[PDB]
Amino acid sequence: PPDLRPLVPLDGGRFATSDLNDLYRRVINRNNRLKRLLDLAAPDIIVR
Amino acid sequence: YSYTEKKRIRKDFGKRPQVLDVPYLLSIQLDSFQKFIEQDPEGQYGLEAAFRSVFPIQSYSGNSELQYVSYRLGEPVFDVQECQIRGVTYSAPLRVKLRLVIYEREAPEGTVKDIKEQEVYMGEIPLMTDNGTFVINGTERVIVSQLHRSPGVFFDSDKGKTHSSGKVLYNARIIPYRGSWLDFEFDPKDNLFVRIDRRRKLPATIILRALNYTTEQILDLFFEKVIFEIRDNKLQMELVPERLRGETASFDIEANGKVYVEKGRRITARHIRQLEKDDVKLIEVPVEYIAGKVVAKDYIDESTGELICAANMELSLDLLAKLSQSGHKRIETLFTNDLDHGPYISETLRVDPTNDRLSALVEIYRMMRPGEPPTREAAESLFENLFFSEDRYDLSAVGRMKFNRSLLREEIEGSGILSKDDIIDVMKKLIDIRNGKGEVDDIDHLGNRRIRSVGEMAENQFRVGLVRVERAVKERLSLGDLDTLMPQDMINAKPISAAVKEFFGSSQLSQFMDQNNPLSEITHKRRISALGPGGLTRERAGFEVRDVHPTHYGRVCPIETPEGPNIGLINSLSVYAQTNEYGFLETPYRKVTDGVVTDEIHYLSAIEEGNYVIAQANSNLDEEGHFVEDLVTCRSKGESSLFSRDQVDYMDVSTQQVVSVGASLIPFLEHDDANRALMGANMQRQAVPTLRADKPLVGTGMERAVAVDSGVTAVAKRGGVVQYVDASRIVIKVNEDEMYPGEAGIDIYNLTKYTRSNQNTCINQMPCVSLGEPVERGDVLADGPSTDLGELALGQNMRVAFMPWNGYNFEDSILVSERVVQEDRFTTIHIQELACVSRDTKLGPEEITADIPNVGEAALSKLDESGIVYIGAEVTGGDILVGKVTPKVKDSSLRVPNGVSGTVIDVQVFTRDGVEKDKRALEIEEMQLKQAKKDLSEELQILEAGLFSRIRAVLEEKQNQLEQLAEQYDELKHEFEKKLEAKRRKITQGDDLAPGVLKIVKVYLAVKRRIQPGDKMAGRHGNKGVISKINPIEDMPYDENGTPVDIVLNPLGVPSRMNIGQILETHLGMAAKGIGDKINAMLKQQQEVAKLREFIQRAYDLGADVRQKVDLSTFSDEEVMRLAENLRKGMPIATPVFDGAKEAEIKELLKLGDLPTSGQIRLYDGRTGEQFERPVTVGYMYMLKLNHLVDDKMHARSTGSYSLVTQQPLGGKAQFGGQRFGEMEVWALEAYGAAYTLQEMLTVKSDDVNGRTKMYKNIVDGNHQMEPGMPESFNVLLKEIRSLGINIELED
Amino acid sequence: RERMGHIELASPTAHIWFLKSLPSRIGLLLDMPLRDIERVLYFESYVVI
Amino acid sequence: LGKRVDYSGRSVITVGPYLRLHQCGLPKKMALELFKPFIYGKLELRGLATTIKAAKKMVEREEAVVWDILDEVIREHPVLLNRAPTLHRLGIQAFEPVLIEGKAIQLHPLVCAAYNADFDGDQMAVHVPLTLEAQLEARALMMSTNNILSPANGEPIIVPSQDVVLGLYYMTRDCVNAKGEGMVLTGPKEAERLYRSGLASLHARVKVRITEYEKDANGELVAKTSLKDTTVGRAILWMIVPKGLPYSIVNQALGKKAISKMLNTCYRILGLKPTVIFADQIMYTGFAYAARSGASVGIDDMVIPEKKHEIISEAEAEVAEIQEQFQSGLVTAGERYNKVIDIWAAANDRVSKAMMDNLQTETVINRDGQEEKQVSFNSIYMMADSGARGSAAQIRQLAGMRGLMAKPDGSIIETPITANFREGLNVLQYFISTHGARKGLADTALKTANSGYLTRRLVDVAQDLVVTEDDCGTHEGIMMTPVIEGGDVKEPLRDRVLGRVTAEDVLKPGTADILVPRNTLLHEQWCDLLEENSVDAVKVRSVVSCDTDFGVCAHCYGRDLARGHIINKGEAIGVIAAQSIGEPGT
DNA sequence: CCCTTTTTATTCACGGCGAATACCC
DNA sequence: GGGTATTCGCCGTGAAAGGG
RNA sequence: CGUCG
RNA sequence: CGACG
Ligand SMILES: [Mg+2]
Ligand SMILES: [Zn+2]
């Protein structure tokens, strides 16, 4: 749940965030890339 | 004497005169950056070596050459005094000149078309000030040195730590400067393996086959070749008399009718002497010795062209029969041994099938890259740029020197690249250690460790930035177009600026400097830390690394290490210790020639110390340079032994060579233990400056070096007289012999008043010179924090008695009277900093305008019409200082936290170019321009008076001179107007801020902290403790005169802790106070001058061969009264750490000042008023005050805020949090019953957000009943395990 | 704090706690050493089905 | 397992010698901050404030109305004092806090031996219980007056450390000649009056009439009047001693262990109620007479033996002669080094013996004509002999030579440190001492973390063992016997079987009868019969040979070494055992 | 909001447990 | 045809950032 | 055990 | 997340 991973909006040049949210965002990005890759009839090495 | 020493002469008790003066303590920080800044024609050190390692560069198929011309540093627009109050980085721009030429077509050395030279700016480097600090973000920053291992080759070993067998195992390790390591380890099965960068194992034949070596070019190097020849009967080998010692008799050794060794006879010296005397060459060997040898070279045939056998095989009977019947005259082999030699190369060649260079390169590419398939060309390029490329593997001169010194080479210069013979010499040195004729080295020796300063780390970071810039321009020039635009914007200054901001900012060795004491600043600047980048880890250290080697004599102080996690690694540098050219350490030594001690000094390194013999500094002389004793103690190679008189080669300089400058200020160091002196040196660094810092009665004499070596005081640059004395500035008119013909004239010294340090401690400089006092060069002008007339004054001194007083000094506590509180002695001013940041906000930005809601009617009287608090108003923690409004009305005003109540002394407003204040920053700018105008008017009024005197003395030659001085006056007024316009453009310029802020206001609060029960006070010998109760005056014990004792200590720590130097310090302080009271007795009444001068001469002539030798006959009548005024509170005593005063001199000084010999006078009780049964040791001791105030330790919380990730209270004092109930407290509660105590500890107080409110309501209504509830942390854990692929629930 | 979400996977994947448990659960359940499981899971070799 | 708590504070410890054993000192600001809802509830129940906000405004404005309300809530409400390093159960105790002026907590000196907290800037935490059951558990179980014994052994933890033992040693001592020697007194009050008036000295052999009470009968206490030759200070200290103790515990030398044996005798004869007042009265008398003693150190207190230089000269001559014999080619170096270190150890022992003989016999006082020799009244000798602060080895290193300083790699240098701390030293006699000090500091800094990890591993092994039964009945057991390493004895029979139920009957070697039954407790009376019968091995039930499922019984454990009775049912003894094992591991 | 290519290569003490080569009957 | 002693590695505790 | 970002 | 006592 998002209450277990608090993201306080800091004030500065860079944004402060948690690493677990970035890992989950990377997992969702890889899953969406694989979902876009399966809809194009890709060969074996790229889906591998 | 100088003008400072004539004010108050400190009496010295040293018996041995010094030969070498104490040098500048900040030389290890100043000379390295000086060599980094300036240019050298050789290009060895500095920025020239960094620019020469990259330039020149050459692109492939482009014919473009970008060479180097010169460079020049720029001048910063801000000085040091402006960046400390502005916030910008004190740095200077770097201007470099390059030249880009282009060649013709099909001509690598053709002519050029055009030249491209310009001035390119690449980043701003931070400049070091005169004290050795760096201003990064307005704070002075000090980068400490790094003690790392020198590049080269070493030999480590393990004492059976890997295998269970009891034996020894050696290993060689090559450490380069920038490259990959090379480990050559042994095995218990007599094998050799190669480990590179902690990768997988690899035998030594692969690294030998890859260097273009055959099989016959390997076995002939590590072994001796034995050549057999065919004879008529009983074919024989050659004999060497030095190769058959240690082997049993295998046959009957007999030649020419005389029997040498029979069957089963051990070789004695007579038999080998007869063999060396006969030296015959015809001796037979039987057939059972042939099969024990191996093959050295593969036998080829000259008739059929077929090989007989391969290389490194076993000799059999059919093979020797075929070799005898074929016609092979030369039979080659090697020699095998068990106590002299070792067949390791023959064993290594039979554990792997690697025979050719191709399989060796395949194994190299497999060990280096386990995923990529092996090949031929890329593996050859990989082996080319591993160890035979200067861009990826380069060593310095110290690495080549340590590599050639460990292999017995006379050349100390090289190219810095590894060759093929270096590995052969390393393996040949490694074999002799295993065989028995070698020796092992050690890592803890100071000859193998190198100190890296900031001048090398900044050069390495600049080289990293330069190689990044040249890699970027090489990747850009591979596809870009040429002769298009001037090479000025193609060089990106952003990677170099990011590299120097990462190096000078967030780094392991770039730490803050604590400005609580000048001795603390000197110790922090002279700090040798073994940790940092490129070193070891604190948590991964062992026993011998934290242990100090005996070769640290005079180079590392043994009683200055921080106790705790890192002890023995953050050690400090000694007094006379100096760096070397290669980066080592050297100490001066007096040269002893045929018994005559010459006054010249010689700096000896760590490896040169053991080669010679050095005597001790505590040796009596006959005033001629000779030793009065025959046998004296010295050191030969690391141990103490008695030597003769002629055998003495060197001698120490002084007794203060071993300890540092932090441990030299402890009087009577030889009477204390090592742990007590270590704790005293650690607590002396944490001294806090009091309100009126007075002089110590018992000192050493190096306090003046600490006072004038650190940039915390004001010294005179040129000699002259003082013209104007003020608390803000000091105007000194220079003399005529030091006045430059082109200078401005007088010198103006600005004094910092009430500035904030890094430890929230108030620091200021107060003047000490009078109106019209002659000063000279090197004379002090203003006493800063912890300074008394150019001497370091850490704490105060008072009456100290050692007796138990009603249990108020039970373990370590200190009973302090109310006279110390009433005399305003231990009161410290603390300055805090409170800022207010106003950033961007949607639907109404953050402003400091009027009509702030949620206020009171009393808040308007303390603020102005804008909202800024006035300077000089006593505030209370919880009030409103800066009222900031945030439209979204919402209030975001800056408030004072509870626990601090001070006075506003300075308000700094930093505005941007968009919004400018109309009443706050403008009056600050007017005050700064008025101060600058007053300063320039006071500096040029003397020049205007001199020009008026010139125009009155002068007023055709005279008309031409009048026109000359008139046009000079016009040029002077023109440059005056130009300087005024330049100062107006400099002051009213502005600054840059972060993208997002509007303005930043800062309010400084000055709180006055006094002494209270709960504070921490200590001395200089390790007598730490706290204060229990402020006793009244009439309750304290007193002597017959009625003077009460200020501090009552505990004498129980004297038999427990071995620090008895505090007793000698107390007796010496009592004698000094008696001398001062006898001096003041001649000043309270009307006395003469000659009797006081005679008493002063008697006080400075105790005897026992002192080295002070003052002369009071040369003093005039005006300075004797000033000296008596400076000595009416007590005479300072200089006591060195090992050349200190004896007990007889203390007894003579006690007998001189009408004091008893034992020093224990009978004291009466304060409460009852009767004499004690035993005499009490009472005297004067120099006490200190530590930075452990009770106002920063007391914290309590009943209800407060909680975290968001879990329902638990916070922790600390700045945030409103509670104490942590650890697991050991839960174990201690489980040792008792404590069921409902543990149920309310971790469920009601922390968790149960609906249960703790019910508990608070029950306490309010008057019910002491709780609920169990449900802990929220267990629900967080249940939701966390359920986020994985593991299911967990609760069953009913 | 108690409401959760789920992410579907278009391609199946293996677990880590049942792979490097020392000993492995999949390595104990099947007649296979760990290196062949790492070869199949990292697409290095095939298995006949 | 570890959470942040509320109603907690932290400050710096202070001695505060005017307090009692069951109370401590709390500041007014901490007592006002940690007791805000109690003050709010008292203001609501008293009917003084209108609402909770009015009470909050009255509290945060610093008024003089809620100050006497604090006297009703910090009267019978104990707090939980705690040190930041916790090793066993005595690190968390309960005290009744009083209102003092300052910003520091006053920790009692009698519990400092259990807390292991000196006053060199140490900090401690204080907790406030909220539940009524938590307050009753802090009063009845976690109180400082209830926990006076050690959890590892049956020894009292409330001992005079350095100052009270020095005051009791200076008050009770024998002299040969003083003011008012040879007079007979009528009681202890006359001796105290003569000491306070100044007509008689503190250390003088006088005769007083004392009445000692005995409890040999059952139900009453008899009395007997006698006149014994004693000291005036012992007659003053007899008023501190209650009626349950005889005069044989007062007339001794009264060192460090004598006060502990006196407190153990008072606990084993009278109980817990007269002991907590007797220890406080001992501490009050010691703190009162420590100011009257006036012991101080100096230069003349650390004497130097005049025959030390002769021993040093003959030792250096012997090393020079054996070095000449080594250089001549007679004795090899491997035995010459052992001979040099042996004669240096012998010279160090001779110098130490001469220094001890000079320290213990240096004062002579005459009585009539000829003079007499007695024990010296030196301050360092009084602090070393009584066991107040410092062992004998530190006095040997201080006055005499400190001996040989060893190298940290394992070897030891053959030449020792000649000069002592009173005389001057060079840099050669200060290097190896710094080597050994840095080695010892790194050793303790690593071994305290090793001991912390060891006790952290040792708590979780026996964390689930609760006594659930009283009697089970087992026929097996261990053979308890004092072990013999080869020389003399090390642990007697009394300190091995004290408070443990035996397994079977003990066979007598002389007459072969039955001494003890099977299920019986071994108190302080059966051990005397066991040592008088001179048995070899006793079959005693242990913890390993029990048969209770999921825990042990009350008979297989025995005495809990905290109380005189048996351990009650439901005590987690495994955590106490792990804490008593892991505590002296440092 | 998205691909790619030239090489950032960075150092404990001690113990438990799993896996590829071997001599002998 | 067939198996555990010895050894050697892995794990437990205190290659991806730059511009438009 | 604290301070800092 | 690093430095310091
Ligand atoms: Mg302490
Ligand atoms: Zn049982």
Side-chain angles (χ1 to χ4, degrees), chain D residues 83 116-122:
Chain D
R83 203 175 174 255
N116 203 22
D118 47 357
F119 300 98
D120 54 356
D122 292 4

Side-chain angles (χ1 to χ4, degrees), chain D residues 291-407:
Chain D
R292 298 290 301 272
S293 46
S296 285
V297 292
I299 309 298
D300 301 6
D301 296 3
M302 301 175 298
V303 300
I304 301 299
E306 292 301 326
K307 59 190 301 298
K308 178 188 177 182
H309 186 267
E310 304 176 358
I311 300 176
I312 290 173
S313 314
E314 309 165 339
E316 284 176 359
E318 196 181 9
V319 183
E321 282 291 327
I322 202 62
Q323 189 195 15
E324 189 180 3
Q325 287 186 3
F326 162 69
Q327 289 182 357
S328 189
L330 318 180
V331 179
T332 187
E335 313 302 340
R336 198 255 308 178
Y337 168 73
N338 297 20
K339 180 61 68 180
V340 166
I341 198 176
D342 213 18
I343 65 181
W344 272 122
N348 183 31
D349 291 331
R350 282 177 55 182
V351 162
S352 197
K353 186 182 301 300
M355 182 259 315
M356 191 59 59
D357 291 1
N358 189 29
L359 263 181
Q360 76 182 11
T361 57
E362 70 177 5
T363 59
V364 283
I365 305 106
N366 48 1
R367 176 64 176 90
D368 40 355
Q370 55 184 358
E371 63 179 6
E372 289 170 312
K373 184 180 298 300
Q374 63 153 2
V375 180
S376 87
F377 273 82
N378 201 4
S379 81
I380 176 177
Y381 185 74
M382 276 188 303
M383 286 181 287
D385 181 69
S386 61
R389 200 58 182 179
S391 300
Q394 298 168 341
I395 314 295
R396 284 170 180 175
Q397 292 186 4
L398 185 54
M401 48 175 60
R402 56 188 305 182
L404 304 102
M405 303 304 298
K407 283 188 174 182

Side-chain angles (χ1 to χ4, degrees), chain B residues 721-785:
Chain B
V721 297
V722 188
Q723 183 181 0
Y724 177 65
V725 178
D726 202 0
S728 315
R729 67 171 67 94
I730 293 178
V731 174
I732 289 182
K733 180 180 181 180
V734 300
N735 287 327
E736 269 63 66
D737 48 69
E738 292 182 346
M739 181 175 60
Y740 293 147
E743 72 179 15
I746 64 177
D747 297 330
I748 300 177
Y749 298 94
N750 295 273
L751 260 59
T752 61
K753 300 298 293 301
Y754 296 91
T755 43
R756 179 194 171 272
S757 84
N758 295 328
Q759 311 293 138
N760 296 330
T761 310
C762 163
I763 47 176
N764 63 326
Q765 299 179 0
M766 41 179 59
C768 49
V769 294
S770 198
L771 189 65
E773 180 179 358
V775 300
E776 62 176 16
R777 187 178 185 271
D779 207 300
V780 288
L781 313 176
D783 313 328

